[PDB]
Write a protein that binds this ligand. Sequence first.
Ligand SMILES: NC(=O)c1ccc[n+]([C@@H]2O[C@H](COP(=O)([O-])OP(=O)(O)OC[C@H]3O[C@@H](n4cnc5c(N)ncnc54)[C@H](OP(=O)(O)O)[C@@H]3O)[C@@H](O)[C@H]2O)c1
Ligand SMILES: NC(=O)c1ccc[n+]([C@@H]2O[C@H](COP(=O)([O-])OP(=O)(O)OC[C@H]3O[C@@H](n4cnc5c(N)ncnc54)[C@H](OP(=O)(O)O)[C@@H]3O)[C@@H](O)[C@H]2O)c1
Lengths: 351, 351
Amino acid sequence: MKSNGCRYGTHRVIEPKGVLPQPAKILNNDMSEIWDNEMLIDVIRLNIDSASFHQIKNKLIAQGHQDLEKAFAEHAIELTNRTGKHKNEDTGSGGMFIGRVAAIGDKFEMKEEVKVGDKIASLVSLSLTPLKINKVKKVLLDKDQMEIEGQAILFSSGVYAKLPDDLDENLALSVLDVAGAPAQVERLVKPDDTVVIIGANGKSGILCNAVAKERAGICGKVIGVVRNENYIPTCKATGCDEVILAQATDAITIQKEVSRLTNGKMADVVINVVNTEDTELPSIMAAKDRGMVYFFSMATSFTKAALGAGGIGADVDMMIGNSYAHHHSEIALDLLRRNSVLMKIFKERYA
Amino acid sequence: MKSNGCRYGTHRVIEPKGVLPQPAKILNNDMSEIWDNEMLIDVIRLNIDSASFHQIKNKLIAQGHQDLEKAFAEHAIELTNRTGKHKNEDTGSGGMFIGRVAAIGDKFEMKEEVKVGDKIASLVSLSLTPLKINKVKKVLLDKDQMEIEGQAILFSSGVYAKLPDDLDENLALSVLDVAGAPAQVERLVKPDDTVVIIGANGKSGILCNAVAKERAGICGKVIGVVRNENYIPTCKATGCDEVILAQATDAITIQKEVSRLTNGKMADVVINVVNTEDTELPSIMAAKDRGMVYFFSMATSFTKAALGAGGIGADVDMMIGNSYAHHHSEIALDLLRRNSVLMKIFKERYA
Ligand SMILES: NC(=O)c1ccc[n+]([C@@H]2O[C@H](COP(=O)([O-])OP(=O)(O)OC[C@H]3O[C@@H](n4cnc5c(N)ncnc54)[C@H](OP(=O)(O)O)[C@@H]3O)[C@@H](O)[C@H]2O)c1
Ligand SMILES: NC(=O)c1ccc[n+]([C@@H]2O[C@H](COP(=O)([O-])OP(=O)(O)OC[C@H]3O[C@@H](n4cnc5c(N)ncnc54)[C@H](OP(=O)(O)O)[C@@H]3O)[C@@H](O)[C@H]2O)c1
């Protein structure tokens, strides 16, 4: 065991020098001796990024490979052994792994309590994960996955979730996928708040509906916004008191309907969890003066939010929805355990 | 004086229907009768967006116009008379105007107290401003301006600043450009906070240095970050207690230097005011646990911040720097009046 290791992982950066593992081109994936603050994993499955996976598979077909499953297998071994990680050299994507804990450093910053043998999922990108592929058992082209045998490093700054046996299935990775959303909502929503959730039928949306209603309480008002009227029962069943029918890009409609349902006082907290562009200005206009607008979605444009609010003189706070929060996986899993309505919907939708 | 007018200005939207003035293609620029909540301006100068201005001038030179000032003038009049506003039809950029107040609706939501005849600048984009150009006196090709005779509408939701009588105007207009930054810093920085300002020598940086230090107080710590060693005296003279020499993209150096200067405690508030990309992760890594990272610059990428913080498990708050805040023009101008050092530095650089 080697001592004084960087939680950000610079001790495993080979090329170039003085950059973090993610921007690094070549990482040190030598799993024979670990650092004091690292944690080693016996990798079971690689969930590759769907655009990265699709991109590599096509490039192998354009070079005239016949056996795509082996060619992808061939591509993975060469990529990881040369660069130390499965960072797509063209798109710069990656993914996550599922494995079992293999060794734990003495000075490892423990987040979720795990021991050797625990089955954990990774919530950080493969583009920063030291990875060594010893064998490729299967290459599922339709599942963007690889059944392998290898090992990976989690730095002390890394993020992982302990996968439960009592919760079965891939219920958890669909939850870990959006676990940062409900954890953040419970920090934002006060008792008696009026909450507007735009994209209230989505994966993270319905989790936000439930947590928002729990926090705002009996005298709070949770208002969903959805594009399609077939979604109204689900929004109300997952916590919305009222539901608006509008395109998330329809700023004027959403404003008048929120104003009507709140007698012109508007929302204290607006949660945006749609996957569409040009919904920044509608989200801003649903909020009251000095209200909170929380952007969770990757379709959010920084510039449209920052300048949009200026043009209409909207003094509201606009926060970038962090993908991580302390205990966000435990909290999101707890939410499904406490909320039977959500649990069923998740098992039906993302089993 | 027509009644029941929308503060967002939808009552002047001709094409298409049910969109805000900004995305609208054609606005109603009929200045013969105003609405009850609007304010009419006799425009003196049009400061067009420099990318929009440059693009139009080039488009006119590639179409083979000889008299460029005369060609630009006709392009402005035709665009405004056809569409009602000076929104660039290709890039979608506008700008700002300077004028004197001509008429004030009785139901106009007055922010800064102004009367008829007061010389005001507008802080909302020309891309949403109903504008009618009756004459183009001058077309300053090197200064991105047009000395015109026309009129513009300000909606109740618009933002404007009264040009001060006690001050200059080359100076005052330069401050409104960044007035949202010092106003926001005053809300974020608590007494005894450690404040890190990335881009500490810039226009907004020096305003942020001063506001951070007065708010953080004698037992607070204000740390500037600059690439160039010639900037340390200005950074320290405008409020920084310490200055780090590093590239804003150098996460590891900035992290080690903030840690060294704070005995591993890091910053309570990180203010990012560089207009360089790939500074999200350095800003995040300078913050302490649960600290605040405020992104003011338009070079900020939403996804790089949102995913960047996740990969290193940084549970920090990331705020989108709103371009507007209540009384932000008065607050930034007051800052220059109390601080002679800022005033002197501003007069030299921006006049
Ligand atoms: N950093 C993180 O933690 C993280 C992780 C994953 C995803 N995200 C981002 O956060 C968002 C949450 O996505 P998700 O996982 O909840 O997937 P999702 O279920 O697809 O969420 C999006 C929902 O919004 C609705 N919607 C989309 N466009 C709309 C529009 N124009 N008008 C009205 N409704 C609209 C969709 O319903 P209909 O299309 O049926 O109307 C959809 O159900 C994603 O956009 C993603 O970019 C963030
Ligand atoms: N109303 C609006 O349009 C609006 C509203 C909100 C925010 N903003 C944005 O706020 C941002 C702040 O810019 P500003 O005009 O206030 O300041 P600025 O005058 O553009 O200065 C930026 C400063 O950052 C310094 N810096 C230090 N290290 C750097 C590095 N590695 N890369 C780049 N710069 C570095 C620069 O010094 P060097 O000379 O060494 O580079 C420069 O002094 C702008 O992006 C602006 O677009 C605009």
